[PDB]
Amino acid sequence: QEDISDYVAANMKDAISRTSGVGDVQLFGSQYAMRIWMNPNELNKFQLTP
Amino acid sequence: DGIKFPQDGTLEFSDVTVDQTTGSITLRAIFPNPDHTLLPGMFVRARLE
């Protein structure tokens, strides 16, 4: 779902919005985002907190 | 600056103690220094095979 949503937001939203007669264009997904998943064991190992 | 050292050193005495704060051990390498192009205390990168 995320890959498809980002592809639509990148290479489909602009062209579809930039034709004749089209008003608001809404996206039903969310584009990419760099997710950083912590690990409490590793955080404890190096003496670190979020 | 990134200049490759013309001479080559050798690794010896891989340590066994583990640093608490970081979680890493230390290794010692020996490099011949005939031309005094290296000085004590400087920061360097090492390539190990």
Coordinates of C-alpha atoms in Angstrom, one line a residue:
Chain A
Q1 CA 0.0 0.0 0.0
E2 CA 2.8 2.4 0.9
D3 CA 4.8 1.9 -2.3
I4 CA 1.6 2.4 -4.5
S5 CA 0.6 5.5 -2.5
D6 CA 4.0 7.1 -2.9
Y7 CA 4.1 6.3 -6.6
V8 CA 0.6 7.9 -7.1
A9 CA 1.7 10.9 -5.0
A10 CA 4.9 11.3 -7.1
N11 CA 4.1 10.5 -10.7
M12 CA 0.3 10.5 -10.9
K13 CA -1.1 13.3 -8.7
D14 CA 0.5 16.2 -10.6
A15 CA -0.4 15.1 -14.1
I16 CA -4.0 14.1 -13.2
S17 CA -4.4 17.4 -11.4
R18 CA -2.9 19.4 -14.3
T19 CA -5.4 18.6 -17.0
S20 CA -8.5 20.6 -18.1
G21 CA -11.5 20.9 -15.9
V22 CA -10.2 19.1 -12.8
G23 CA -10.6 20.7 -9.5
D24 CA -9.5 19.3 -6.1
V25 CA -7.7 16.0 -6.2
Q26 CA -7.6 13.9 -3.0
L27 CA -5.2 11.1 -2.1
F28 CA -6.5 8.2 -0.1
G29 CA -3.0 7.1 1.0
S30 CA 0.1 8.6 2.6
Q31 CA 3.5 9.0 0.9
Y32 CA 6.7 7.6 2.3
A33 CA 8.3 8.5 5.6
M34 CA 11.6 7.3 7.1
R35 CA 10.6 5.1 10.0
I36 CA 13.1 4.6 12.8
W37 CA 12.2 1.5 14.9
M38 CA 14.0 1.6 18.3
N39 CA 15.1 -1.5 20.2
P40 CA 15.0 -1.3 24.0
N41 CA 17.8 -3.9 24.4
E42 CA 20.2 -2.0 22.1
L43 CA 19.2 1.3 23.7
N44 CA 20.1 -0.1 27.1
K45 CA 23.3 -1.6 25.8
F46 CA 24.8 1.7 24.7
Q47 CA 23.4 3.7 27.6
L48 CA 21.0 5.8 25.5
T49 CA 17.4 7.0 25.7
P50 CA 15.0 8.1 22.9
Chain B
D1 CA 43.7 14.3 3.4
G2 CA 43.2 10.8 2.1
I3 CA 46.7 9.9 0.9
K4 CA 47.4 6.2 1.0
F5 CA 50.3 5.3 3.2
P6 CA 53.3 4.1 1.1
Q7 CA 54.3 1.7 3.8
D8 CA 52.2 -1.1 5.3
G9 CA 51.8 -2.1 8.9
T10 CA 50.6 -5.2 10.6
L11 CA 48.0 -5.9 13.2
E12 CA 49.1 -7.5 16.5
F13 CA 47.5 -8.1 19.9
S14 CA 43.8 -7.9 19.4
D15 CA 42.5 -7.0 22.8
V16 CA 39.9 -8.8 24.8
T17 CA 38.4 -6.2 27.1
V18 CA 35.1 -4.6 26.2
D19 CA 34.5 -0.9 26.6
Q20 CA 31.4 -0.3 28.8
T21 CA 30.3 3.1 27.4
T22 CA 30.5 2.2 23.7
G23 CA 30.6 -1.6 23.5
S24 CA 33.8 -2.1 21.5
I25 CA 37.3 -3.5 21.8
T26 CA 40.6 -2.0 20.7
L27 CA 43.3 -3.4 18.3
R28 CA 46.9 -2.4 17.9
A29 CA 48.7 -2.1 14.6
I30 CA 52.4 -1.3 14.0
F31 CA 53.6 0.9 11.1
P32 CA 57.2 1.7 10.2
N33 CA 57.7 5.5 10.1
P34 CA 61.1 6.3 8.5
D35 CA 60.2 9.7 7.0
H36 CA 58.3 11.0 10.1
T37 CA 55.2 11.5 8.0
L38 CA 53.1 10.3 11.1
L39 CA 52.9 11.9 14.5
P40 CA 51.6 10.6 17.8
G41 CA 48.0 11.4 18.8
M42 CA 46.6 12.2 15.3
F43 CA 43.3 10.8 13.9
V44 CA 43.6 8.2 11.2
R45 CA 41.5 5.6 9.3
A46 CA 42.7 2.0 9.1
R47 CA 41.8 -0.7 6.5
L48 CA 41.9 -4.2 7.8
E49 CA 41.7 -7.4 5.7

